Amino acid sequence: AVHLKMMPEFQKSSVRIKNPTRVEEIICGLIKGGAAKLQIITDFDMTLSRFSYNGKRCPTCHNIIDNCKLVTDECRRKLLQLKEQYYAIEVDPVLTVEEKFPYMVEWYTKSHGLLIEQGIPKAKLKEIVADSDVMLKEGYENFFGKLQQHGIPVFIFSAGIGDVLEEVIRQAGVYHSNVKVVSNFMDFDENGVLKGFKGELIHVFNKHDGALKNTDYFSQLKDNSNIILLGDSQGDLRMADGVANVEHILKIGYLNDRVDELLEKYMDSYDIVLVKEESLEVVNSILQKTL
Ligand SMILES: O=S(=O)(O)CCN1CCN(CCS(=O)(=O)O)CC1
Ligand SMILES: [Mg+2]
């Protein structure tokens, strides 16, 4: 039987849970299925990576490029201005999520377009990532390590920049075979210089679309009917829409900011909400019982 009361990781004050009995029953199902039924579906930015260090916000994959030696101060000025106008739409309490779709498409297209003008070479990405301020959440080596040890599928589904994300995990030593990355990947010209992005855009609000356009992945994993989902946004709740069959799904949400405004809604939609939390110890504690 599962008792969150007896799990020290769940006693941390950042752990917020509306329905602990329900959560205990989901984790109970996860444990019963063991490795053979488990898969992970996860966002990256601010979910696997830290939201902040020392009251200095940490970079998203996109910020890593925004901030690198290859990008001019004037470019960052424009990027900032984009962010200020479009982020106000993102968080607008009056617009429906569907109304925000076109605005999100513009923001990501305009900001990608400014990066494309700056001339980013594939060969520089290693240096850029090494020099950046990126940080993975505390407990990431045990997270990725237990999962790879047991061959648990991990589907990292990111509205960031795929090439940057992959380079971060590769340098961390955690880009193992069990880890599949679906993101916005760079398109490179004859000289290995960024010229655009591949595929259809993934942004914060359309992850349902991408989840459905990955049937190949999920149909191979028909038996993995127990899911752990990790996200930092309401949008990440859709990352599991492509899953073949679902027996148990546990949804863990990082609430990194706009805490007072969003806490109720997060507690309502995620099973476990982690408030201003920079570790993976709750999820690692669940893996520990399960694997
Ligand atoms: O599922 S299997 O039977 O194949 C493996 C069993 N697995 C072994 C490790 N224990 C740790 C006990 S606990 O400390 O996590 O409770 C959890 C379950
Ligand atoms: Mg994110």
**CATH number, position 81:** 1.10.150.340
Query: Which residue has its alpha carbon closest to ligand 1 atom 11?
Result: 289
Nearest CA to ligand 1 atom 14: 289
Decide which of 87, 114, 133 is a domain's last residue. 133
- Compute the residue count for the chain: 291
Closest CA to 169 of 124, 126, 217: 126
Run of H or E residues at 57: strand 56-57
- The count of other CB atoms within 10 Å of the CB of residue 144 is 24
Is 226 part of a structural domain of the chain? yes
Testing ligand 1's pocket by substitution, the residue of 285, 288, 290 carrying the most ligand atoms inside 8 A of its CB is 288
Using CA atoms, how far apart are residues 261 and 263, in angstroms rounded to an integer?
6
Provide the domain count of the chain.
Answer: 2
The experimental method, as deposited, was X-ray
241 part of the active site: no
Q: What is the helix (H) or strand (E) element at residue 249, kind and residue range?
A: strand 248-255
Residue with tokens 């939390």: 277
Tell me the two tokens of residue 42: 């996860």
Pairwise CA distance, residues 141 & 114, whole Å: 34
Contact by Cβ (8 Å): 214, 242? yes
Q: Are residues 25 and 66 in the same domain?
A: no
- Classify residue 173 as left (phi > 0), alpha (psi -120 to 50) or beta: left
CA proximity to 138, closest of 290, 291, 289, 274: 274
Active-site residue identified among 45, 163, 236, 271: 45
In this structure, the number of other CB atoms found within 10 A of the CB of residue 227 comes to 24
3 and 75 co-located in one domain: no
Atom of ligand 1 nearest to the CA of 289: 15
The CA 26 to ligand 1 mean position distance, Å, reads: 16
Using CA positions, which residue lies closest to atom 15 of ligand 1? 289
Of all helices (H) and strands (E), which one includes residue 209?
helix 207-212
Residues with CB under 6 A from ligand 1: 34, 288-289
Please check if 111 is assigned to a binding site.
Answer: yes
CA pair distance 137, 140, nearest whole angstrom: 6
Q: Which ligand 1 atom minimizes the distance to the CA of 31?
A: 1
In this structure, which ligand is nearest to the CA of 48?
Answer: 2
Do 142 and 241 reside in the same domain of the chain? yes
Question: Would you tell me the crossing angle of helices 140-149 and 281-290 to the nearest 10 degrees?
Answer: 20
Resolution (angstroms) equals 2.2
Q: Which ligand is nearest to the CA of 31?
A: 1
User: Is 43 among the catalytic positions?
Assistant: yes
* Nearest ligand (C-alpha, residue 34): 1
Q: How far is the CA of 287 from the centre of ligand 1 (A)?
A: 9
Q: Are residues 127 and 5 in the same domain?
A: no
Residue 145: both structure tokens together:
């390590």
Asked whether residue 26 falls in the same domain as residue 94, the answer is no
Is 24 assigned a ligand-binding role in the annotation?
A: no
* CATH label of the domain that carries residue 42: 3.40.50.1000
* Nearest Cα residue to atom 13 of ligand 1: 289
127 in a domain, yes or no?
yes
Q: Which structural domain, as residue segments, surrounds residue 210? A: 1-47+134-187+206-291
Q: Which of 28, 146, 291 to mutate to test the pocket of ligand 1 (most atoms within 8 A of CB)?
A: 291
Domain termination residue (choose one: 98, 113, 133): 133
